[PDB]
Design a protein around this ligand. Structure first.
Ligand SMILES: [Zn+2]
Length: 29
């Protein structure tokens, strides 16, 4: 379930792989 979260934007991921890559999409364009 909600194991990982992208802070600042408050994104709630059930995936870790998608979470971490999501914090990547923030560094990227
Ligand atoms: Zn985010």
């Amino acid at each position: 379930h909600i194991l990982y979260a992208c802070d600042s934007c408050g994104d709630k991921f059930l995936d870790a792989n998608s979470l971490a890559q999501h914090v990547r999409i923030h560094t990227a364009q």
